[PDB]
Design an enzyme around this catalytic site. Structure first.
Site, PDB file in Angstrom:
ATOM      1  N   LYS A  61       0.818  -1.179   0.000  1.00 49.96           N
ATOM      2  CA  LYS A  61       0.000   0.000   0.000  1.00 49.96           C
ATOM      3  C   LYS A  61       0.867   1.251   0.000  1.00 49.96           C
ATOM      4  O   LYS A  61       0.625   2.173  -0.786  1.00 49.96           O
ATOM      5  CB  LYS A  61      -1.026  -0.044   1.125  1.00 49.96           C
ATOM      6  CG  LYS A  61      -2.125  -1.072   0.874  1.00 49.96           C
ATOM      7  CD  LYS A  61      -3.051  -1.212   2.061  1.00 49.96           C
ATOM      8  CE  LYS A  61      -4.327  -1.950   1.674  1.00 49.96           C
ATOM      9  NZ  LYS A  61      -3.983  -3.356   1.981  1.00 49.96           N
ATOM     10  N   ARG A 138     -11.879  20.105  20.817  1.00 49.69           N
ATOM     11  CA  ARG A 138     -10.978  19.883  21.931  1.00 49.69           C
ATOM     12  C   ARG A 138     -11.241  20.909  23.034  1.00 49.69           C
ATOM     13  O   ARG A 138     -12.043  21.867  22.867  1.00 49.69           O
ATOM     14  CB  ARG A 138      -9.517  19.790  21.484  1.00 49.69           C
ATOM     15  CG  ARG A 138      -9.279  18.427  20.829  1.00 49.69           C
ATOM     16  CD  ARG A 138      -7.855  18.160  20.398  1.00 49.69           C
ATOM     17  NE  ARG A 138      -6.965  17.754  21.481  1.00 49.69           N
ATOM     18  CZ  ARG A 138      -7.118  16.659  22.217  1.00 49.69           C
ATOM     19  NH1 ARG A 138      -8.167  15.887  22.015  1.00 49.69           N
ATOM     20  NH2 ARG A 138      -6.231  16.352  23.173  1.00 49.69           N
ATOM     21  N   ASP A 181     -12.225  13.159  32.762  1.00 53.97           N
ATOM     22  CA  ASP A 181     -12.336  11.874  33.398  1.00 53.97           C
ATOM     23  C   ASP A 181     -12.038  12.066  34.882  1.00 53.97           C
ATOM     24  O   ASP A 181     -10.899  12.405  35.269  1.00 53.97           O
ATOM     25  CB  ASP A 181     -11.380  10.877  32.729  1.00 53.97           C
ATOM     26  CG  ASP A 181     -11.568   9.461  33.233  1.00 53.97           C
ATOM     27  OD1 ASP A 181     -11.430   8.518  32.430  1.00 53.97           O
ATOM     28  OD2 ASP A 181     -11.863   9.268  34.438  1.00 53.97           O
TER      29      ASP A 181
END
Ligand code: NA
Ligand code: NA
Length: 321
Positions: A61, A138, A181
């Site tokens: 590829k 973001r 988180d």
DNA sequence: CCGACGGCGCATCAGC
DNA sequence: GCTGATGCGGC
DNA sequence: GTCGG
């Protein structure tokens, strides 16, 4: 080599989202990754195959990319209405490969199409759809600090005795984050220990309109959406936030694990093995002579984890590797 | 040549 | 009605 | 798709 890593990542996503071949998805990521961190403009596919995780088919590829600036299979799949739509819809949080496919089967191919078909979406997918673009934005550190302030304040205000740490890459000093988180524990909650503990913290953060929606919520894990209060100014994007309640005696394992990074936890789990241990998100155990791990050794700060595998505490600031 | 390539919470489905 | 499977997210 | 047993 952005030409190649984009190709590889584009190929990666079609495997995940269209062929439903999870292992080829990762095969292609591992190769994007290894190449991404490889300090030369790649001249041939033979040059690349040396790198671990770059095998024969990717080598060819590269060779086709380098000679022609494209891949026949890739061009061909980009123009495929079915496939390129199945790939696109999975970008909505809560639509994965199975559901994207079923949609496209019945003609639902665009956000528009989802908008006219709310009744065929579940709770998660409405919220994903609704915040489709906020979710792909973001978060600057600054906004994260502003968000941390709100969470730490509000948690302490529910019960002074709670401990909350914001982990992720943000704790490692990252200039921007993808979501927040939060790891949450409390002295009354150990591996051998109310159903109220996570609920009361979420309840409080809603009361002050910090948490805006709920993707899911249980006794130990919450996932949802949040938003800083708008300063006359243009309002803040909605942000993904998760919050997890961990038993007090597994928190610092949690904190380390959920701090990362990946490349860090690999080396540390490969060094833990060397000095003879096995170190998961929950526990460290001392493996036996045949490979039979015994008792998870107690952990009481991030400090400990390092003593047990004989290491000098690395500051989160530089835990890239 | 051929299997490994991760685990776990929660929401929601498929089967009894 | 219950249990166990499957989809998803994302570490 | 790649690796390794
Ligand atoms: Na996605
Ligand atoms: Na998705």
């Amino acid at each position: 080599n952005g030409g190649i890593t984009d190709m590889l990542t584009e190929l990666a996503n079609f495997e995940k989202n269209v062929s439903q071949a999870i292992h080829k998805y990762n095969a292609y990521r591992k190769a994007a990754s290894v190449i991404a961190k490889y300090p030369h403009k790649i001249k041939s596919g033979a040059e690349a195959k040396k790198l671990p995780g770059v095998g024969t088919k990717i080598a060819e590829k590269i060779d086709e990319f380098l000679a022609t600036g494209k891949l026949r299979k890739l061009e061909k799949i980009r123009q495929d209405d079915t496939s390129s739509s199945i790939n696109f819809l999975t970008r909505v949080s809560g639509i994965g490969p199975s559901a994207a496919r079923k949609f496209v089967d019945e003609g639902i191919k665009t956000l528009e199409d989802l908008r006219k078909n709310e009744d065929k979406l579940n709770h998660h997918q409405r919220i994903g759809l609704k915040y489709f673009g906020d979710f792909e934005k973001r978060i600057p550190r600054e906004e994260m600090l502003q968000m941390q302030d709100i969470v730490l304040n509000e948690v302490k205000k529910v019960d002074s005795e709670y401990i909350a740490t914001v982990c992720g890459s943000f704790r490692r000093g990252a200039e921007s984050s993808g979501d927040m988180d939060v790891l949450l524990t409390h002295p009354s909650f150990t591996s051998e220990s109310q159903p109220k503990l996570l609920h009361q913290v979420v309840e409080q953060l809603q009361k002050v309109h910090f948490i805006t929606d709920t993707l899911s919520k249980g006794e130990t894990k919450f996932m949802g959406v949040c938003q800083l209060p708008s300063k006359d100014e243009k309002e803040y994007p909605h942000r993904r936030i998760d919050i997890r309640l961990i038993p007090k005696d597994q928190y610092y394992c949690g904190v380390l694990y959920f701090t990362g990074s990946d490349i860090f936890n690999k080396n540390m789990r490969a060094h833990a093995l060397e000095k003879g241990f096995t170190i998961n998100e929950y526990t460290i155990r001392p493996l036996g002579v045949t490979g039979v791990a015994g008792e998870p050794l107690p952990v009481d700060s991030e400090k400990d984890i390092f003593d047990y595998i004989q290491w000098k505490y690395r500051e989160p600031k530089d835990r890239s590797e």
